[PDB]
Amino acid sequence: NDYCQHFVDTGHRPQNFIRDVELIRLKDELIAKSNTPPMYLQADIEAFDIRELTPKFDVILLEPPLEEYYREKCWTWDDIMKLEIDEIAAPRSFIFLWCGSGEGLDLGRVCLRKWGYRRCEDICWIKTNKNNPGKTKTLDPKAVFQRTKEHCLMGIKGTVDIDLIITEEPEIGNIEKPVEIFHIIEHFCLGRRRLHLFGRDSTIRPGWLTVGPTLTNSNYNAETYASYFSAPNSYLTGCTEEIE
C-alpha cells in the first residue's frame, strides 16, 4: 500500500499507520540511582552571562523557542548562533539541539560547527494526526510539502534506541517536546553534568540542571551543584552504581 497516496486521499499522515510506536530496566534504575537532585534557575538567557553556569557540562539539551513553534520572546537563529555554548561545554561533551523543520535544519548545523561539535545523529520527532485527520497544515511559504516532523540534532565534541520518536501532534500552542528525548539521552550514559537550556517548570527532572526565562522558582547554587561531581564521583557515566 502507498500511504503517501492515502494521505492525499484521506488526510491521515503515513506515520499514523506505523505499528507498535527485564531487558533495559536495570539501566533506568541505575540511571535513577545515579541522578543528581533536580536543579533549576530562572534566567533570561539573552541578558545572562552563560559562563556563570558551572561546571562544564557533559550533555547540553538546547531548546530555543523558535518563531515557527507559534503557528496560531521568540528566538531567531541569529540569536541562537550568538550563544557562547562552547564556553560551558566540557572538552568531551554532547549537545542535543531542537532545530524545528525549516531553516533550522541548516542553521542548527552551522551552530553545531560554530560551537565545536560535529553531528553524529539526527533524531526525528514524527507527529501523527490520528485524532484530527481533518486538519490541513498552513505551509511555510518555501515549503514543498506539509511539515509533519521536527529534528533534534545530536553533536559530539572531543574523542538500544532508534533515531525516531513517534507521538501525536500536540494541541495548537503546546510547544513541549516529547519527554522521550530525555530517555534517549540518558540511555547514552554520557556523564552526569546535564544542562537543559530553555527548559520550563514542566520539564524539570532529576539528573538535570534546567535554565530558562519562564521558571517560577530557582534553587541553583554553583557550589552545591559542583559538589555532586567532586571526587570520587568526577567521571561517573550516570549508568553505574554509586561509589560507597
Binding site: D2, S101, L105, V144, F145, R147, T148, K149, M154, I184
Partner: protein
C-alpha cells in the same frame, strides 16, 4: 516523449547539456561516506563538479543523503545553486508496518532543493514522511515517484545514478548499469546525434 528513457553512461563525463531543462531532478549519489561499500564511489570533488546547474532553470532537486553526506549534500546543493526548502524522511518498516553509530537508524533522508521561481507546481499535497517497506536493499522507495508526479504532473524529470528498476515515464534515467541508450524525445535524440555522432562518451 512520455515513456521511459535512459542513457548508460558515466555521469562524470556525459555532456548533460544535450538533455535540456527539467522540472525535477533527483539523485541518489554514491557518496564517499568514509566506509567500505560494495559499489564504486565518487569523491567529494567529483560530486561538487557535477554539472547539475545546466539541468534546470526553475524547479526542485531531490537529493538522498546518508552519514557525512547530510552535510556534504547540503554543500553541493548550495554550490549548484539550490536553497534547501524541505527534507523528506523515509521510515523503514517491514511488511507488518513495524520499524526495521550511537543510535540504530530507522529512516533515510532526502533533501529537497529549490532553484529559481517554480510556478505551477502543487506544493503541499504530500507530507514529508514516507512510511514504506524495504522492498530491496540499496533501493529508494517507489512512493517518491508518486509524490514527485503529484507535485509536478506531466513535466520532464531526470534521475542521476539510477538503476534499471528506476526507469519511469516522464523520466530520463542516467546510470552506468543501464542497458544501452534508449531515447525517444526528438529534441534529445537530435542533440545526442550531433554531440555524439559515433555513440560514444569518453573524456
Amino acid at each position: 516523449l512520455f515513456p521511459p528513457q535512459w542513457i548508460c553512461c558515466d555521469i562524470r563525463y556525459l555532456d548533460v547539456s544535450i538533455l535540456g531543462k527539467f522540472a525535477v531532478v533527483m539523485a541518489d549519489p554514491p557518496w564517499d561516506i568514509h566506509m567500505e561499500l560494495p559499489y564504486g564511489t565518487l569523491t567529494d570533488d567529483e560530486m561538487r563538479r557535477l554539472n547539475i546547474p545546466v539541468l534546470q532553470d526553475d524547479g526542485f532537486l531531490f537529493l538522498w543523503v546518508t552519514g557525512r553526506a547530510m552535510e556534504l549534500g547540503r554543500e553541493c546543493l548550495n554550490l549548484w545553486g539550490y536553497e534547501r526548502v524541505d527534507e523528506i524522511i523515509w521510515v523503514k518498516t517491514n511488511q507488518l508496518q513495524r520499524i526495521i553509530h550511537w543510535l540504530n537508524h530507522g529512516k533515510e533522508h532526502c533533501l529537497v532543493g529549490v532553484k529559481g521561481n517554480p510556478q505551477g507546481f502543487n506544493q503541499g499535497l504530500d507530507c514529508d514522511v514516507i512510511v514504506a517497506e524495504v522492498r530491496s536493499t540499496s533501493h529508494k522507495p517507489d512512493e517518491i515517484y508518486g509524490m514527485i508526479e503529484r507535485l509536478s504532473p506531466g513535466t520532464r524529470k531526470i534521475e542521476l545514478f539510477g538503476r534499471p528498476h528506476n526507469v519511469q515515464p516522464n523520466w530520463i534515467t542516467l546510470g552506468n548499469q543501464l542497458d544501452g541508450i534508449h531515447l525517444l524525445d526528438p529534441d534529445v535524440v537530435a542533440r545526442f546525434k550531433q554531440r555524439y555522432p559515433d555513440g560514444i562518451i569518453s573524456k
